[PDB]
């Protein structure tokens, strides 16, 4: 718990790029975590700011560092909705099977909310479809239950 | 009339005593506080919601509540907050002069018809509604030395054995407890509860069957069998009493015949209500009581009744038990009434010096000595009739009215001594014609004043509640004062004065006082000498005229606008600020370190320390915290270091080395139940349900806007919290049928544990109290004892919480704020350094327009009060210039002569703006009202300047220059008499540096250095106004 | 008769009767008023575009508009002309039968699934001694 | 409904009484509290009072106490209203 | 349908109700529009 | 009955003064409020 990394995670938060730009040249510790254990990275994807997490990876963020519950930013930015953030993190090596502590995958998250885009995406990069959760429910399972037909016919 | 009662002195002298009289009754009789009732009549809802977050307390009560608020009279605006701490705020602020009961009834009478849509657990709470306008007379802090007793401990006792006693104590108007009266807790344990196959529900079902009050009847009860010779009533089950009978309660029975009961599976204490506040006085555990005075209540008499009672309760208090006084502010207002009585008779003394040293005679100084009490006193009965009470704004409005008053006494005495001494006619034949030259005159300046103080009164909203109190104490004093000068004051003279031989000006005489009357006579012939040469070239005094108005100008632009000085009341704040998500003990060890700085560092000037942990004005979080620092007494901090200022800079210096700890030092306003009232009060409005996300953004867009303009804004701070990380968690509802688990039992067995649940009723020596079943600390502090809790199924198994849910972290609001019924964010910040609230209100009104679609904006508090006070003033300014012109026309018979009175106004400001920007203080209320009544004197000796001069053209049928050098000539003495009294009077408030200094600072400069320049100028500028109006239209 | 104090009195004497009313007619919230008969204004809202439908617009009214005007000092009563939305669970005999399933537990499921549930916090007052974590714990919330 | 004297003055009357403070024109208070469970508690005020602004202030002193009585006290109504102790007249009826 | 409260001034509420309802008019979907169909008031105001 | 009592002294004080005072106010004197005012006490000791 640096003084400049709990000001990155702020930044990374509110979205102020030129803040961001400057503690990155000062060394601001991208790897710094509040008490639930997120990084810059996940504020950064949660609140959907895009250059961020660009610069965050640039400077050696980690793409699959999870919280205290075992969630990765490629979790918070397919279940807000965040198509462009999805991809950038898949093209850094973002693991696309990651499982929290519930087993709930990228995939079910983005199924849920119903997000088409990043469904395709999320699948294009080698998502398990048939990737169960702790209570043994697919991403198809989650469709047929919320009642999107267009989420269901992808899910084939 | 003065005529009438020169013929007639004992009914002159009758109607001085029933004036008298009636002062005297009102003195005693009269209320006594700090200020009167300045802020406007606002009702606060207050509810209670147990372990429940900001949007469920807003989303099931505040929504509810709000939407139930109509057919409420004078409602102005309606703003609400909804926080984690599981509490709703609902503030109904109302239109000023709107009766608080009445609208506190209205509001009271809609939230009773609304409590059904409220749910069970709000309604077992119940809502509170309270005057939250109102403040505190004092804080009376109880501590426990010897370490025997807890905060808890010592809230039950003030509650059982203090609270009542005080409160029916003579002129207390409401008492709060500082903390609350025992509860029975239920300290629940899960590895006990899931080895006897139990849950949260099973104890709740348990204690609500074994503590509870059960109906019975009557042995021969009515209708009964004939021949009944006994009638009793039959005493079933009533409430347990004891933590013994608690533990005691039945849960289950096993096959073998063991009992299971709830002190196998809990631990049973008497604890507090809630564990938010951790209450300490110099490290010590503290509890308290604030007392607020009742209406029409003496301020001075109550805080003496309640030490008084406090005394009583001694004897009965246990081992180290002692009583303490953090915040009091009767002292200050013991001051207040001292140094105000001080000043009055101080002014009396310095008339009578001023009197003798020119007029030297012991008869002629009596007369003002007797005249001037019999107004003050009249003043106080005019003000009992109105029904104000005596407090600062009152007090002070006498101090600067002794300007007025004692002219009116110097004025009609002087000139008789003079109609005497010139002319050689007797006391009584003197005063029928000095009092014939002056009478039509003191009518008309009645009216002039009166045209300049009695629209000041007609100010709407905070401001012209305090403009109200000067305005009815200065017209009031004022015409007295015209009606003594009139009825008594010429009967005292006629009587009183001995006759003056024909030319003796006291030149005869030897010593000081023959030095003094030589050397003046030849004064009042350089001064005539000089005027005579000013006249002879007035068009150089016309651009030095203009030189005066373009320097007043100037200043006014240049000397920064604030509401009251900041006094030192023996107290001050220390907030404490962690960030966000930071737990109760961190924000202790900052509070326990701010404190040992006090005790340490400010051993000299602090008294006490009282840390209030976990406590805040806007949301009560665990992050911040806040110190109300009590200091010694006034005489034991000697110098400018050692006050509230000095040490506040001091203070926030040293904590701002501190590491994760936002710590500062600041002190109180003035008026504490307002505020600073300095800056802008905003409201960022969610018009089209864009939701909470989308508010934010906008938010953070208008905050990054207006960073671009230091210029114009500075300190844009909002006054709610940011969102924090909370504990999501998803209730499987397939798995938890299929296990055969209700969903009641899983909501129950987490809220009860994690949250806390009010179960029932229970009486502790024969007091009502609450009984709460909660989990013990440690098996709900983190997500892994989430797993920890079992919850039973319907075919007996005990299912794990893990088993039927999912969790995951997300951001949400810790204090969700509305306005009128919409989400809003309270944004606040002030104008910058040489910028005014209008051009800083009128910028943040641009920015607002240019954020997204869907998002409006309002003004609140201090603002809206502004904007409607603001629109009425140059209505209020225009009605005072026209008919102070139209009396003045009425007075002289003329259109144009009245403009040679009005032009002296410049005269009296330039100098209070001097004196002001020099000392380097604010153009406050005090300063402005100072203005007023340097103006209305300076004024007043033109108005007689300008009469003599007419008078002396019209019956005598002298020239301009011989009839103006002449009135100048016979006006020059009483003009130099009240200036030299009056400004040595207002000296002490000036060079004050005490208790109240502030204020006695603001009213002492302004009119100082006003009356310096409004003497010295006037004297040569008056002259040259009435030869150049005169001149100019015929 | 001062209207204030009218309406004191009767509400005094209604909250006796409160309690001992049903409990499906103290929900709908009991309203004590003291206003004229006639009506001072009607204020008409239209689409001119044509958007929105007659059910559009009465909940616009009474879910932006109603509630600020009710607010407003001097009007006694707002009577709305429509109606605000609300959820219709428009139930079917032939389906419910079918599952073996009646309205009371379409009820009963309405009032367990959509709830809004008071869970406590983690690191909750009073805590243990080296509490770091404190958050709201966040469990069923009202359906949108 | 059922509460003893003892119990009913515990639970309800010393509540009530506890929060009638501080009200405008009161000169004093007397109350008493009786084995079927009844309350009455008689504030008396000073000759030219508002006896209307009187029963508001008395009103909303009241709300304040009201969440911290029982349930059963709250299910029954707390009635706030002017009272006089004397009768007018007593209209007797019988059958002839 | 908007009723006058009893003993209240028609001229100065249905003032503050053209007050309220311009500060709703800006954050309005497109299309929505108020209407004036029934009015007590104006008749008060341009018969005095 | 006890508030009565008590405050009887003061109203015969008050009375009293106000009446020397109109006295002194219409008459113009001292003396004949003083020579007027000292029969109270003939007519108080008959009602007694
Ligand atoms: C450095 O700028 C900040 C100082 C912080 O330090 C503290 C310790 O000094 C303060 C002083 C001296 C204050 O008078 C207030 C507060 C603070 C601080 O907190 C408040 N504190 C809060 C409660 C806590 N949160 C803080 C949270 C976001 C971390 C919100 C603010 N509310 C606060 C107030 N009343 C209100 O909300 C409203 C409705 C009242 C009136 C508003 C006017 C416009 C302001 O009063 C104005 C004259 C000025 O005082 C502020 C612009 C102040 O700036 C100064 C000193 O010029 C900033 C607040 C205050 O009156
Ligand atoms: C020592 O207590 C005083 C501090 C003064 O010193 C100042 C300079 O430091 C402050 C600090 C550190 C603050 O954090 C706040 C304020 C002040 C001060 O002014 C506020 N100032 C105001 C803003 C202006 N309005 C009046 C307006 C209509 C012109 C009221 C005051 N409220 C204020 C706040 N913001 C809010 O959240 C609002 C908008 C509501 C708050 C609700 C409270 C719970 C109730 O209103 C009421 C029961 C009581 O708590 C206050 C009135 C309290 O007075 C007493 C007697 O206890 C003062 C806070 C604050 O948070
Ligand atoms: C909102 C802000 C407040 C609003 C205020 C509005 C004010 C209304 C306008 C009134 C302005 C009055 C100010 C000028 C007064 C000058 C009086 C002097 C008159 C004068 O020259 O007469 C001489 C002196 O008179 C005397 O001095 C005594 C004799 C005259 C008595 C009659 C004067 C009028 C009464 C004053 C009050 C008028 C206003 C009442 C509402 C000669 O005396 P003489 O030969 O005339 O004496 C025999 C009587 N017959
Ligand atoms: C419940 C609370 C009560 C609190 C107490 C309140 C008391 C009420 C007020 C009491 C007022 C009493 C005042 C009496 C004054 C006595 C005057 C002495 C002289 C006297 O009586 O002899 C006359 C001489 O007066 C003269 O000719 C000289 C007159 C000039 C001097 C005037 C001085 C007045 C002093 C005022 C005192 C102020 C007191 C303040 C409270 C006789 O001659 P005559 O005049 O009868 O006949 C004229 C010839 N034909
Ligand atoms: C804070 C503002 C700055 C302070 C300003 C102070 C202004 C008031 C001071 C007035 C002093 C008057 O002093 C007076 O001035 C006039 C000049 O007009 C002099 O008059 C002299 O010059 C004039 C020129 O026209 C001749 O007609 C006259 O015969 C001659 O004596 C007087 O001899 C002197 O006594
Ligand atoms: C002889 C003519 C004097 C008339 C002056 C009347 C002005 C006061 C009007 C009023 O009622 O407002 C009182 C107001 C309340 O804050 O007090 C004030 O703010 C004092 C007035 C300021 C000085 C005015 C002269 C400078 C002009 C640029
Ligand atoms: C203890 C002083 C009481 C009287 C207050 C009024 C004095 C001007
Ligand atoms: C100076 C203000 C009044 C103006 C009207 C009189 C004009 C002679
Ligand atoms: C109101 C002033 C008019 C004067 C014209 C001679
Ligand atoms: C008690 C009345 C006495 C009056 C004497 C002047």
């Given at each position: ?156 | ?913 001097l004196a002001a920007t020099f000392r380097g203080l604010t153009n406050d209320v005090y300063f402005q009202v100072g203005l007023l009544t340097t103006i209305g004197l300076s004024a007043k000796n033109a108005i007689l300047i300008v009469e003599f001069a007419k008078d002396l053209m019209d019956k005598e049928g002298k020239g301009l220059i011989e009839a103006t050098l002449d009135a100048v000539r016979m006006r020059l003495r009483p003009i130099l008499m009240t200036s030299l009294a009056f400004i040595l009077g207002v000296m002490p408030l000036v060079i004050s540096t005490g208790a109240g200094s502030g204020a006695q600072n603001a009213v002492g400069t302004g009119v100082m250095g006003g009356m310096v320049t409004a003497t010295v100028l006037a004297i040569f500028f008056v002259p040259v106004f009435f030869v150049v109006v ?5």
């Amino acid at each position: 718990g640096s003084d400049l990394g709990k000001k990155l995670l702020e930044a990374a938060r509110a979205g102020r790029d030129d803040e961001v730009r400057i503690l990155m040249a000062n060394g601001a510790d991208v790897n710094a975590a509040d008490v639930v254990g997120w990084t810059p990275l996940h504020l950064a994807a949660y609140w959907g700011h895009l250059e961020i997490v660009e610069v965050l990876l640039k400077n050696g963020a980690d793409v699959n560092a999870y919280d205290t519950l075992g969630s990765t930013p490629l979790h918070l930015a397919a279940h807000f909705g965040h198509l462009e953030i999805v991809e950038v993190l898949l093209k850094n090596g973002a693991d696309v099977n990651a499982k929290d502590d519930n087993g709930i995958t990228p995939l079910h998250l983005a199924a849920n909310r119903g997000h088409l885009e990043i469904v395709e995406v999320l699948l294009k990069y080698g998502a398990d479809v048939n990737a169960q959760d702790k209570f043994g429910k697919t991403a198809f399972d989650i469709s047929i239950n919320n009642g999107n037909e267009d989420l269901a016919e992808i899910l084939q | 009339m003065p005529n009438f009662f020169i013929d007639r002195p004992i009914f002159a002298w009758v109607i001085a005593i029933i004036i008298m009289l009636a002062g005297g009754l009102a003195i005693l009789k009269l209320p006594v506080a700090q200020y009167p009732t300045i802020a406007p009549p606002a009702v606060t809802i207050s509810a209670s919601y147990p372990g429940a977050d900001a949007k469920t307390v807003q989303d099931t009560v505040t929504q509810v509540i709000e939407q139930n608020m109509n057919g409420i009279d004078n409602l102005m605006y309606m703003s609400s907050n909804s926080d984690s701490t599981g509490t709703v705020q609902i503030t109904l602020t109302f239109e000023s002069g709107t009766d608080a009961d009445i609208a506190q009834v209205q509001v009271q009478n809609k939230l009773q018809l609304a409590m059904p849509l409220l749910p069970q657990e709000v309604q077992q709470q119940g809502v509170s509604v309270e005057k939250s306008s109102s403040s505190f007379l004092m804080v009376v802090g109880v501590i426990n030395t010897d370490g025997t007793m807890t905060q808890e401990d010592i809230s039950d006792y003030v509650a059982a054995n203090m609270k009542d006693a005080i409160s029916r104590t003579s002129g207390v108007g409401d008492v709060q407890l500082f903390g609350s009266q025992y509860a029975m807790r239920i300290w629940m344990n899960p590895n006990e509860l899931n080895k006897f196959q139990l849950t949260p529900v099973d104890v709740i079902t348990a204690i609500k069957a074994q503590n509870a009050q059960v109906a019975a009847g009557q042995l021969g009860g009515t209708p009964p069998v004939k021949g009944q010779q006994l009638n009793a009533s039959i005493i079933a089950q009533t409430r347990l009493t004891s933590t013994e009978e608690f533990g005691k309660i039945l849960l289950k029975v096993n096959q073998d015949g063991s009992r299971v009961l709830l002190r196998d599976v809990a631990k049973i204490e008497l604890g507090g209500e809630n564990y938010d506040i951790i209450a300490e006085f110099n490290g010590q555990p503290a509890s308290g009581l604030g007392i607020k005075l009742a209406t029409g209540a003496n301020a001075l008499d109550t805080a003496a009744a309640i030490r008084a009672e406090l005394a009583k309760m001694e004897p009965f208090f246990p081992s180290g038990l002692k009583i303490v006084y953090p915040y009091d502010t009767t002292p200050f207002v013991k001051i207040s009434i001292h140094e105000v009585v001080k000043t009055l008779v101080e002014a009396i003394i310095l008339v009578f010096l001023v009197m003798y040293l020119f007029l030297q005679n012991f008869r002629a100084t009596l007369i003002p000595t007797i005249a001037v009490p019999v107004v003050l006193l009249g003043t106080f009965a005019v003000l009992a009739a109105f029904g104000f009470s005596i407090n600062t704004l009152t007090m002070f409005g006498m101090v600067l009215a002794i300007g007025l008053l004692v002219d009116d006494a110097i004025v009609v005495v002087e000139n008789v001594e003079r109609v005497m001494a010139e002319e050689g006619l007797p006391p009584k034949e003197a005063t029928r014609k000095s009092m014939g030259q002056i009478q039509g005159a003191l009518v008309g300046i009645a009216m002039v004043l009166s045209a300049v103080f009695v629209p000041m009164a007609f100010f709407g909203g905070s401001t012209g509640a305090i403009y109200r109190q000067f305005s009815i104490t200065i017209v009031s004093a004022m015409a007295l004062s015209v009606l003594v000068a009139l009825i008594l004051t010429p009967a005292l003279c006629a009587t009183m004065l001995k006759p003056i031989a024909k030319g003796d000006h006291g030149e005869g005489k030897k010593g000081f006082f023959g030095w003094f009357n030589r050397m003046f006579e030849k004064s009042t012939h350089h001064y005539t000498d000089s005027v005579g040469g000013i006249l002879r070239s007035t068009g150089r005094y016309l651009v030095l005229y203009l030189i005066i108005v373009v320097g007043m100008a100037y200043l006014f632009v240049r000397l920064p606008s604030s509401f009251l000085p900041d006094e030192d009341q023996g107290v001050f704040m220390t907030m404490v600020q962690l960030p966000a998500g930071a737990t109760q003990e961190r924000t202790q060890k900052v509070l326990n370190e701010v404190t040992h700085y006090y005790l340490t560092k400010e051993k000299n000037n602090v008294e006490s320390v009282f840390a209030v942990n976990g406590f805040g004005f806007a949301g009560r979080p665990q992050n911040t915290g806040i110190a109300f620092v009590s200091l010694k007494d006034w005489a034991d901090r000697p110098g400018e270091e050692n006050k509230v200022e000095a040490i506040t800079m001091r203070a926030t210096r040293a904590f701002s080395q501190i590491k994760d700890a936002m710590v500062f030092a600041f002190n109180l306003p003035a008026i504490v139940e307002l505020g600073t009232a300095t800056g802008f009060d905003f409201e960022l409005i969610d018009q089209a349900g864009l939701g909470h996300e989308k508010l934010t953004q906008a938010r953070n867009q208008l905050l990054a806007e207006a960073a671009k303009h230091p210029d114009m804004l500075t300190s844009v701070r909002p006054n709610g919290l940011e969102d924090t990380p909370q504990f999501k968690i998803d209730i499987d509802q397939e798995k938890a049928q299929a296990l055969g688990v209700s969903i009641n039992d899983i909501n129950t067995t987490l809220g009860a544990a994690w949250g806390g649940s009010y179960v029932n009723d229970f009486i502790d020596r024969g007091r009502v109290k609450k009984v709460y079943v909660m989990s013990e600390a440690k098996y709900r502090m983190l997500p892994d004892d989430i797993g920890d809790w079992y919850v039973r199924a319907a075919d007996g198994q005990m299912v794990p919480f893990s088993a039927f849910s999912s969790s995951r972290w997300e951001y949400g609001s810790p204090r969700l704020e509305r306005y009128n019924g919409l989400p809003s964010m309270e944004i606040l910040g002030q104008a910058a350094p040489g910028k005014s609230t209008g051009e800083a209100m009128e910028l943040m009104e641009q920015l607002a327009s240019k954020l997204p679609t869907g998002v409006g904006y309002d003004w609140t508090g201090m603002s809206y009060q502004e904007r409607l006070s603001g629109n009425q003033a140059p209505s209020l300014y225009a009605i005072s210039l026209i008919v102070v012109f139209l009396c003045l026309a009425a007075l002289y018979e003329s259109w144009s002569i009245p403009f040679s009175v009005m032009l002296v106004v410049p005269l009296g400001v330039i100098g209070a703006l001097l004196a002001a920007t020099f000392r380097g203080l604010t153009n406050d209320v005090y300063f402005q009202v100072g203005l007023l009544t340097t103006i209305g004197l300076s004024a007043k000796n033109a108005i007689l300047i300008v009469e003599f001069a007419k008078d002396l053209m019209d019956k005598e049928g002298k020239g301009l220059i011989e009839a103006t050098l002449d009135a100048v000539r016979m006006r020059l003495r009483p003009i130099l008499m009240t200036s030299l009294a009056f400004i040595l009077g207002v000296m002490p408030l000036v060079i004050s540096t005490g208790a109240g200094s502030g204020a006695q600072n603001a009213v002492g400069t302004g009119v100082m250095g006003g009356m310096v320049t409004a003497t010295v100028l006037a004297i040569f500028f008056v002259p040259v106004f009435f030869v150049v109006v005169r001149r100019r239209f015929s």
